[PDB]
């Protein structure tokens, strides 16, 4: 039950992925010491609705209260935007955006480092991005997803980091979450052979310590069991005839929008 997108659908995904990407570009100047995450969420929502004439896919989804997720330091994912929550020097910060435009979803996140990098935050963010990028470079018709999960996990662990098991990338299109599940580690269960026009996300969560996570008493916030740092990047892609196209590319990405394995 993997959706194959038509060229008209893929074009709608390009628009929606571009808007999601542009939310993350827009917000970047506002990501500063002493800004609250509640404020950042406010800026993002206004932009999505008022300017982009889009909607947040996150708002209301399984009851999620805000328009974007903002996750700091040892928060793994689903960090809830909040006014007592102030950014400060050294923080690593994930903003994860999903927009619906013209029926189609675009889903992307990046890390921002606030004020002065700590060495360890820098390394973790860089390795996590490189883990996404290497997975992106493998995407092409006829490869299996199992191969890709296995490659991400190998790279990350070689750094003495760990891969979060509980959250995975996913098909995306008219549905926020569609088949397949894209696991960022090796599993016998995986057996999806990629085909031109599947669209999905890859979104590895990498912990500097151990892979175990815990959910907080707000019912949303996910943290490392061990309080070590955690980082995540996410891109929405379409499988093309000889590679992939990243639908959520930003100006700060250092990988090409179109990755071609063709002679
Ligand atoms: C184990 O997988 C899950 O728990 C569910 C969470 C439910 C409550 C939405 N799925 C996810 O967390 C997925 C994997 N997350 C994402 O797709 C994020 O990329 C996406 N932007 C997002 C979706 C939904 C929420 C509440 C937050 C972020
Ligand atoms: Co996301
Ligand atoms: Co996602
Ligand atoms: Na984090």
Swiss-Prot record:
The identity of this protein, by name, is Methionine aminopeptidase
Function statement: Removes the N-terminal methionine from nascent proteins. The N-terminal methionine is often cleaved when the second residue in the primary sequence is small and uncharged (Met-Ala-, Cys, Gly, Pro, Ser, Thr, or Val). Requires deformylation of the N(alpha)-formylated initiator methionine before it can be hydrolyzed.
Reading the lineage from the top rank, the first entry is: Bacteria
EC number of this enzyme = 3.4.11.18
Subunit structure of this chain's protein = Monomer.
- Tell me which residues bind a divalent metal cation 2: 107, 170, 203, 234
Query: Which Pfam family would be a valid example here?
Result: Peptidase_M24
| Classification via InterPro entries | Creatinase/aminopeptidase-like, Pept_M24, Pept_M24_MAP, Pept_M24A_MAP1
Catalytic activity field: Release of N-terminal amino acids, preferentially methionine, from peptides and arylamides
Q: Which residues bind a divalent metal cation 1?
A: 96, 107, 234
Similarity field: Belongs to the peptidase M24A family. Methionine aminopeptidase type 1 subfamily.
Q: Which organism is it from?
A: Escherichia coli (strain K12)
The residues the record assigns to binding substrate are 78, 98, 177
Question: What are the protein's GO molecular function terms?
Answer: ferrous iron binding; initiator methionyl aminopeptidase activity; metalloaminopeptidase activity
- Cofactor details (free text): Binds 2 divalent metal cations per subunit. Has a high-affinity and a low affinity metal-binding site. The true nature of the physiological cofactor is under debate. The enzyme is active with cobalt, zinc, manganese or divalent iron ions. Most likely, methionine aminopeptidases function as mononuclear Fe(2+)-metalloproteases under physiological conditions, and the catalytically relevant metal-binding site has been assigned to the histidine-containing high-affinity site.
């Amino acid at each position: 039950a993997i959706s194959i997108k038509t060229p008209e659908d893929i074009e709608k995904m390009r628009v929606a992925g571009r808007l999601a990407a542009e939310v993350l570009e827009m917000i970047e100047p506002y990501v500063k010491p002493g800004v609250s995450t509640g404020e950042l969420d406010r800026i993002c929502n206004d932009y999505i609705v008022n300017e982009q004439h889009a909607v947040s896919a996150c708002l209301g989804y399984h009851g999620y209260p805000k328009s974007v997720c903002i996750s700091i330091n040892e928060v793994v994912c689903h960090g809830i935007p909040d006014d007592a929550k102030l950014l400060k020097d050294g923080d690593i910060v994930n903003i994860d955006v999903t927009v619906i435009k013209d029926g189609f979803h675009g889903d992307t996140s990046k890390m921002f480092i606030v004020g002065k990098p700590t060495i360890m935050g820098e390394r973790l963010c860089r390795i996590t991005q490189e883990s996404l990028y290497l997975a992106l470079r493998m995407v092409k018709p006829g490869i299996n997803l199992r191969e890709i999960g296995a490659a991400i996990q190998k790279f990350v662990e070689a750094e003495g980091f760990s891969v979060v098991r509980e959250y995975c990338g996913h098909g995306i299109g008219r549905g926020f979450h569609e088949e397949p599940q894209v696991l960022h580690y090796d599993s016998r269960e995986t057996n999806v052979v990629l085909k031109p026009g599947m669209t999905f996300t890859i979104e590895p969560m990498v912990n500097a310590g151990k892979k175990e996570i815990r959910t907080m008493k707000d019912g949303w916030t996910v943290k490392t069991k061990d309080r070590s740092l955690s980082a995540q990047y996410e891109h929405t892609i379409v499988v093309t005839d000889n590679g992939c196209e990243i639908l959520t590319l930003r100006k700060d990405d250092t990988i090409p929008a179109i990755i071609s394995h063709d002679e």
